[PDB]
């Protein structure tokens, strides 16, 4: 019925915080997801572009 394709950049290892239930400064103050979240988390290396 609708889709929201969010995007952002992290230092690589901080991906462990971008997930429901996880904790950390990121998940607590920048990007928090609800327990009923439904979607996919996709990431790839961008050292040459970013």
């Amino acid at each position: 019925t609708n889709v929201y394709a969010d995007s952002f950049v992290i230092r690589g290892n901080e991906v462990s915080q971008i997930a429901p239930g996880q904790t950390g400064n990121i998940a607590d103050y920048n990007y928090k997801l609800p327990d009923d979240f439904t979607g996919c988390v996709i990431a790839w290396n961008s050292n040459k572009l970013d």
Partner: antibody
Amino acid sequence: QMQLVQSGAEVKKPGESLKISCKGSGYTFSYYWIGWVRQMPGKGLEWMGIIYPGDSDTRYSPSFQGQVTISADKSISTAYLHWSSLKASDTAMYYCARQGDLGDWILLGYWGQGTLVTVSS
Amino acid sequence: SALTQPPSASGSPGQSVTISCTGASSDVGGYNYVSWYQQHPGKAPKLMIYEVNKRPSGVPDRFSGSKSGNTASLTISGLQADDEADYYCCSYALSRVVFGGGTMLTVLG
């Protein structure tokens, strides 16, 4: 001071292969995107593709996906631009550009001296 | 989509002029992915403006970028003899660079 040097003018017959070079200096040829730009006599600039010295992650232009090839050598820090079966419309000035210390990674803040190509029957 | 520019530009020395550029692209990052380049007869081009709300370092203040809707513009504080050169605008939004039709600038007097 950063600078790029290119080969002299090239002259060949229609339907012949050609390959030029463009050597950069004054910077570490490891983390700076390198590409080539086409400019026919009296025409504007036309981008063809870029490459990363760290790895051969070529990104050619949609109009130059198989008409031209781009590559570079990290052991000598010199780009290359090879052609196959040069056509009459390939005569043009080719400049090798690269990113600068600021801006986007495809801004092409610097340019080369240009390499002229001409063909005739 | 490819960019477009007027065929040629003209103006008297000392007076300000503006060169238009249509076809600017955008992405989810922003909408200021526009740059300009200048190329004198007989030499390679040179970056003039990028991120029209700003400009490259060391570039004189005689060049200023702008944009409104889907059309960019380049404003010159004052025309001079050294301004007789070609100008081209480019867009770098969708991880790609495409140059426009260009334009020729000349000064009267």
